[PDB]
Design a protein around this nucleic acid. Sequence first.
RNA 1: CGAGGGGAGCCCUAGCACAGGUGCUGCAUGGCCGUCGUCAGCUCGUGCCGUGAGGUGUUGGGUUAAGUCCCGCAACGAGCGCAA
Length: 118
Amino acid sequence: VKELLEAGVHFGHERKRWNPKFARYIYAERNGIHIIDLQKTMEELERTFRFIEDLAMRGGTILFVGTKKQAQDIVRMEAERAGMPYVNQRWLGGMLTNFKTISQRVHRLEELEALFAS
RNA sequence: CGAGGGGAGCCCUAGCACAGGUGCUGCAUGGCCGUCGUCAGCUCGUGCCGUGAGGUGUUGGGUUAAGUCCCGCAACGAGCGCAA
Ligand SMILES: [Mg+2]
Ligand SMILES: [Mg+2]
Ligand SMILES: [Mg+2]
Ligand SMILES: [Mg+2]
Ligand SMILES: [Mg+2]
């Protein structure tokens, strides 16, 4: 169940352009291909489940960034049914570091959106 | 008993405190004026890069008289300026 679709077809993305810190995962080339690994995907993926479960049941606002091209439509739907904040189009320049200015822009958003009722 | 000690202030016969330069110095100052310029630029808070001056905001594309304001972009935004 948790390893069927992960093992069905999950290979082939941007080949012969690869940062060689990923080199311990590709195990076979046949003609011009580079295979994304499966068994280490299961183990590191399981470590990620047991990390975000134990870290996230306390009530952490676990944010996720899907700004590439086509994870925008999946982040934009899964974020409302998830209950956690998100980002739509691009990462804002210094979103966490300039949270004073961005958060006081949200403080402006708390009173500009109340103008519609008046 | 005022035209007697004189009396509120003033006047002086002539004094005396201090005043007095359309002469330099804006190469000691405050207010100023002209100037580039009615072109569209100049700064600040936060955060990043860089040992640093500093850059990033204020870069690239589009167009307007215009830093007027959109897309991406480590930038998000404010103040004086084109306006009202
Ligand atoms: Mg400048
Ligand atoms: Mg600069
Ligand atoms: Mg720009
Ligand atoms: Mg102009
Ligand atoms: Mg402006």
